Design a binder for this molecule. Structure first.
Ligand SMILES: O=C(NO)c1cc(F)c(Cn2nnc(-c3ncccn3)n2)c(F)c1
Ligand SMILES: [K+]
Ligand SMILES: [K+]
Ligand SMILES: [Zn+2]
Length: 357
């Protein structure tokens, strides 16, 4: 009956030496932690220590080349760091980055171990830099290694290869890397809600559309929920959870739930354009607690409004600690285009999931 929490200030060391106001700020994690202390949620949690991932553990999802190129960034002078960052889509690198990326992955491993040993029921990980855009062979969108994908493999490596892991990615951006790593896999169901705008919204690829349902034995186990036609909030996320996420998760019956918890769909986020409220995030969290006998790990991805990500993640920890879900005052019907999105996903996944028929 215990919630784990991992936070280590050394993860603030990764910074953008060229643009000190880049939105992926060191103080993202320090501001979330401070807010957990102000709401007296910290002292109610079990503190799980951070550790570095090993290179063997990074090879769970990533190639030797990729691991080696990022490792090499530790010793690089700024000129070479700049040159390295520019070989990927929207990466900045510092001396401390590789170590911050290892610490974000090892923290989630220790969290996943605490859950699967029974030391805790569920856990939150306040880590940076984020992960879901990192693929097997490259870095992308502020992500070096895919934290959530590596945690899924780590779980299976201390239990059994077929341990059923559900990854729910409610970060506003599509987890291009998560999807690719597990696209052929029936043991790991990936479900992403994301702004799409027919490929105008980052990371700008048709891989994030609803018709990408997975390949081979993993056909059905890749569920994309792409939003089009501007602003979305609590009503559209509640609806997608009611008709898609929760019916598909129940018929999959995960033994562990991982949340790629970006808070960039928050009211206030300058990159997302959405209005998902802190209470919206609490409801999403509370529904997922109904799965896998409550074995949920919430992993920080994006979210760039310091007040919004502080309020929203603290609100998710409150649900994990077993607090009553807040009143939404849900009084809104769905945007026309969010209904069109949900029926598109229901038509494409009904061949695979009996509960959408
Ligand atoms: O992980 C992400 N969200 O959670 C994420 C990753 C991304 F690469 C992008 C795209 N982008 N590249 N550069 C920038 C940028 N740079 C400086 C000032 C403003 N904007 N935005 C994103 F919009 C979001
Ligand atoms: K997503
Ligand atoms: K999959
Ligand atoms: Zn994002």
């Amino acid at each position: 009956p215990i919630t784990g929490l991992v936070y280590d200030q050394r993860m603030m060391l990764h910074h953008n030496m060229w643009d000190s106001h880049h939105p992926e700020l060191p103080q993202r994690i320090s501001r979330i932690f401070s807010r957990h202390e102000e709401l007296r949620l910290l002292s109610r949690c079990h503190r799980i220590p951070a550790r570095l991932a090993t290179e063997e553990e990074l090879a769970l999802c990533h190639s030797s080349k990729h691991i080696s190129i990022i490792k090499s960034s530790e010793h690089m002078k700024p000129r070479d760091l700049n040159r390295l960052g520019d070989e990927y889509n929207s990466i900045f690198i510092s001396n401390e980055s590789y170590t911050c990326a290892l610490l974000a992955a090892g923290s989630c491993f220790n969290s996943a171990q605490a859950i699967l040993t029974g030391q805790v029921r569920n856990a939150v990980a306040i880590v940076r830099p984020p992960g879901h855009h990192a693929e097997k062979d490259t870095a992308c969108g502020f992500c070096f290694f895919n934290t959530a994908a590596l945690t899924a493999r780590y779980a299976q490596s201390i239990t059994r290869e077929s341990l059923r892991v559900l990854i729910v990615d409610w970060d506003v951006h599509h987890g291009n890397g998560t999807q690719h790593i597990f696209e052929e896999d029936d043991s790991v169901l990936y479900i992403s809600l994301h702004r799409y705008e027919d490929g105008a919204f980052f990371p700008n690829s048709e891989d994030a559309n609803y018709d990408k349902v997975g390949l081979g034995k993993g056909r059905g186990y890749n569920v994309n929920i792409p939003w089009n036609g501007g602003k979305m909030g609590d009503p559209e996320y509640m609806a997608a959870f009611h008709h898609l996420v929760m019916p598909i998760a129940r018929e999959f019956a995960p033994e562990l739930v991982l949340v790629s918890a970006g808070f960039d769909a928050a009211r206030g986020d300058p990159l997302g354009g959405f209005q998902v409220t802190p209470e919206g995030y609490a409801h999403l969290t509370h529904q997922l607690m109904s799965l896998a006998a409550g074995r949920v790990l919430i992993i920080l991805e994006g979210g760039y409004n310091l007040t919004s990500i502080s309020e929203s993640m603290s609100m998710c920890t409150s649900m994990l600690l077993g607090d009553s879900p807040p009143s939404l005052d849900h009084l809104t019907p769905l945007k026309t285009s969010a209904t069109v999105s949900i029926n598109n996903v229901l038509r494409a996944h009904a061949p695979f999931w009996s509960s959408l028929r």
